[PDB]
Each structure stands twice: as structure tokens, then as C-alpha cells.
Design a protein around this ligand. Structure first.
Ligand SMILES: Nc1ncnc2c1ncn2[C@@H]1O[C@H](COP(=O)(O)O)[C@@H](O)[C@H]1O
Ligand SMILES: Nc1ncnc2c1ncn2[C@@H]1O[C@H](COP(=O)(O)O)[C@@H](O)[C@H]1O
Ligand SMILES: [Mg+2]
Ligand SMILES: [Mg+2]
Lengths: 247, 247
């Protein structure tokens, strides 16, 4: 139903306004990247290791909010085929602070590797073109670990380590950017992971804000991503914790 | 129109799910408070000054998300009279990391002052009761600078300084928690303020995420808060930046 598609996408509007328009969102991005630089400068690695930083791309270093805007305007639930066209459109923006941090790491005895679920086979060319245009240094193909057969990222982290790197910090907007332990899990387990790692945030796990999509969306209900539009609407509304209006 | 009230509040749903349910939101809160502790420990003040930390309350140290949930369920635009009842309900929660940071400052030669737009005359009793219950130390009345006649906060910051304190850092979810220079201004000016202070974030200005309300909402359009429901809906949708769907 077009009506359901409309309601589902309307639910994203206020968070999208916040991400696209607010100074507060920018401040959170700068806060993250300022903290990331401190962590990078402090980091020491094992003898014989090279210093690596692992960075997510979407909503961490690259800003895809215009795709979300298109979803709102056209009542379009997420579809990977539309996403591929968005990537090919080569209109990605940079998250504030990301280029400066990236280029600083790469010029100060580190290497940023991009571990991202943009698709290696169909989305790599647009990604690399946009990143060059946006001012990122170090965007030769070998810096990229785009999605091949698995959305979970831990195996790609391991590939980087096998190449003689020690990963000194991770940057992401999704907890699945820090490992696999809550991949595909519901939000209670994901909150628990965060509590179990409280001291790492702003140090070795650097968070960017994303109120629009992610593992937390699937985390709203068992089988969320396989539900139809009406089911996803219901899952979102059922997750709401509300005051009963009483004292 | 009930229909417009419904649409307006539906637009908050996804961001509310993110704030209420996601581990990512918790991680951002921990990141902020971890950074705040580092900044506090590093801070040195002028000879003869006492160390103060200024903290916002709502969506910085106190979590009022159930009020937002009630808005969604009842199609209720924000109303200060409803807000006062929410405060009186004494069901506020704590933002993750806030109590620990607060109590650490207060036991390590600092004092946290709460500069907040909860209302001094009608909302103070519930605020203090909730904070005691939530585990905050240092919540005697004199630690509080609740709203009296002005929503802008700079004058209250000045009161704190007049009492012999040097403010070493500010914690907030709203740029207006850092001063008055973009109070009542639109989002372009607010983004500019952030760019002009890029290096302060995560150091002397500590940001918490709030995708649900704030100065950025009013910042969406001239006279936003005076518009009717339909006008606010239009302002939000008009602010959306969308991909045109082309290459
Ligand atoms: N709104 C959305 N809902 C679900 N998946 C999305 C959405 N937007 C993007 N994606 C996918 O998630 C990936 C995230 O990539 P990254 O954050 O770099 O790992 C994208 O490349 C898309 O395949
Ligand atoms: N959704 C909302 N829209 C506008 N104002 C709000 C909303 N929720 C709360 N407020 C007001 O903003 C104040 C924020 O307080 P604080 O963040 O502590 O300065 C609250 O005490 C309310 O008076
Ligand atoms: Mg991402
Ligand atoms: Mg606040």
C-alpha cells in the first residue's frame, strides 16, 4: 500500500531534519573526529606492526542524507537497487571532520582502511570517485574493503590484521562496525554490548550519530527486515516507550 | 486538525526509536561523558577560582523520552502545560554515563551546576526528587539554575562566574547550552557557530545527541514555533534535501 509506504517514510522526517540541518549534528561529528585524533596520537602498537585505523563509510565518513530525502519525497522504503543508483549518481557528501581526520592519519604514520557495506562489484567506482572529489587522501583501491559475500565486518578486520597492521581504533555509526558479536541481534543485546564496553567509546570505538537507519532498526523486532511495510510500522510503534499521562 | 497533529508526531517516531532502543545512542552518551571526564581532569583554572562544570539537564543528564512517546501515542504537539505534568510525574530517567560523571566531578574538586530550562517555579520539586532517586550527588537547591524569566542561558552562566567559579566545560544537547550567540537563530547561523568552534567539541563543549527537539527545530524556519501544526509540517518537509533520483 502506498499509504503504508508513506507513513513508514514520514517517520524518518524529524531525524532527517536533525541530521541534515542542525548545527548539533555537525558538533557531534566534530566531537567524534576530535576524539579520534587524540586516540590515534596516543596509540602505540606491537613491535613490527603498522598502525591502522578502520573506518566505516556510510554515515561515518560519507553523508548519504539526500538518498533519505528522496525516500521521504517519494514514499520509498529502502531498496538496494535504488541505493546502487544513488551511489552511481556520485553526489555523496563528506561527514564533517572526516576528511581532515582521514588525511591526518594517513600523513602521520597510519593508514585508514575503509570497511564498508557499499558493494564491491557495483558500487566501488562511484565510491572512489566521490571520495577523491571530496578530498580524501589514500583512496587507492587497496585501501577499500567493500562488501563481497558477507555483511558482517569482522572477517575484513581480520584481513587487515593479516597484512601486518594493528588496528588502533574503529570509527562507525553502527555497532556492527566494531565487530560481529551483536550482528543480527536485537536491541537489548546491542545495548548490553555497549554497557560491556562503556570505557571504549570515544577512545578505541568512535561513534557517529545516525537516527535514520542501521542495525538498530532491524534490532527493533525479530525478523524486522523480512516484515512488510505495515509490519515494520507496527514494530516501530510497538517499540515506543510512553508515559501513561499519569502521576 | 487531528490529522495534522498525527502527521507531525509521526515524524518523530524513527528518531525516538533510535534514542530509546539503540545501543548506538547509549554509545554516543558514553562517548560524550568519557570525553568530558578527560577534559575535566585536564582543566586548570585561574588562581583563586573554583572549578565548575555547567551541565544542561533535559536530554543531557535527564532522559525524558517517555514524554515524547506519549506525544506519539496521543498525537500531541509539545505543550508546556503537558510538560509540567510530565515533570511532576517523577518518571525521568538518567542519560547513560551522566550520574557517574556528575558524581566524579563533585568528588574531585569540581562542582556541577545545572543550567536548565525546566521551570524554577513549577518544575523544581520533581526535578530534584528525580535526580536524588537517580543517584546524582550534589543536588541541593543551590546547584540549580532553572528557568525564571529568560530561556537564553548566558546570564545564568555569568551568575555562576560571579560566585567565584571558572567554568571549565559545558555539557548539552542544544547549541544554546554553550552560550547565546545563536539563540533564536536559524540553522545556517547555528551550523556556522559550530564551524567557528570546531576544535572545542569533545573538549570544552560536550555534545549529547537529541533528534527529537531543540533549537534546531525552531531553526528550520523563521517563526517556526509560532506556526500552526500544518505550518510546522510544511517547514520540516521544505527543509528536506533530496536526491532528484537522477545521475
Ligand atoms: N535506510 C537503509 N536501510 C537499510 N540499509 C541501508 C540503508 N541505507 C543504506 N543501507 C545499506 O547499508 C550499507 C551501509 O554501508 P556502511 O555504513 O558503509 O557499512 C549501505 O551501503 C547500503 O547497502
Ligand atoms: N519537544 C519539545 N519541544 C520544545 N520544547 C521542549 C520539548 N521538550 C521539552 N521542551 C522544553 O525545553 C526545555 C529543555 O530543558 P533543558 O534541556 O534542561 O534546558 C524543557 O524543560 C521544556 O520546557
Ligand atoms: Mg555506516
Ligand atoms: Mg537539553
Amino acid at each position: 500500500e502506498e499509504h503504508a509506504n508513506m507513513q513508514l517514510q514520514q517517520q524518518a522526517v524529524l531525524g532527517l531534519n536533525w541530521m541534515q540541518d542542525s548545527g548539533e549534528y555537525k558538533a557531534l561529528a566534530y566531537q567524534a573526529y576530535n576524539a579520534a585524533k587524540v586516540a590515534f596520537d596516543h596509540a602505540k602498537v606491537a613491535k613490527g606492526k603498522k598502525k591502522a585505523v578502520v573506518a566505516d563509510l556510510n554515515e561515518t565518513m560519507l553523508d548519504n542524507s539526500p538518498y533519505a530525502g528522496w525516500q521521504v519525497q517519494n514514499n520509498k522504503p529502502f531498496d538496494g537497487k535504488d541505493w546502487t543508483r544513488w551511489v552511481d549518481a556520485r553526489q555523496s557528501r563528506a561527514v564533517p571532520g572526516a576528511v581532515e581526520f582521514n588525511n591526518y592519519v594517513n600523513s602521520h604514520n597510519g593508514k585508514v582502511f575503509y570497511v564498508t557495506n557499499r558493494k564491491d562489484s557495483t558500487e566501488k567506482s562511484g565510491t572512489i570517485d566521490d571520495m577523491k572529489r571530496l578530498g580524501f587522501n589514500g583512496v587507492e583501491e587497496s585501501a577499500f574493503y567493500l562488501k563481497k559475500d558477507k555483511s558482517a565486518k569482522a572477517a575484513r578486520f581480520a584481513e587487515i590484521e593479516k597484512q601486518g597492521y594493528e588496528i588502533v581504533l574503529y570509527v562507525g555509526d553502527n555497532l556492527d562496525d566494531f565487530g560481529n558479536t551483536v550482528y543480527g541481534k536485537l536491541n537489548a543485546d546491542r545495548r548490553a554490548f555497549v554497557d560491556q564496553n562503556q570505557g571504549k567509546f570515544g577512545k578505541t570505538f568512535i561513534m557517529l550519530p545516525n537516527a535514520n537507519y542501521g542495525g538498530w532498526e532491524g534490532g527493533l523486532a525479530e525478523g524486522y527486515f523480512k516484515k512488510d511495510t505495515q509490519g515494520q510500522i507496527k514494530a516501530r510503534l510497538d517499540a515506543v516507550q510512553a508515559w501513561d499521562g499519569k502521576l
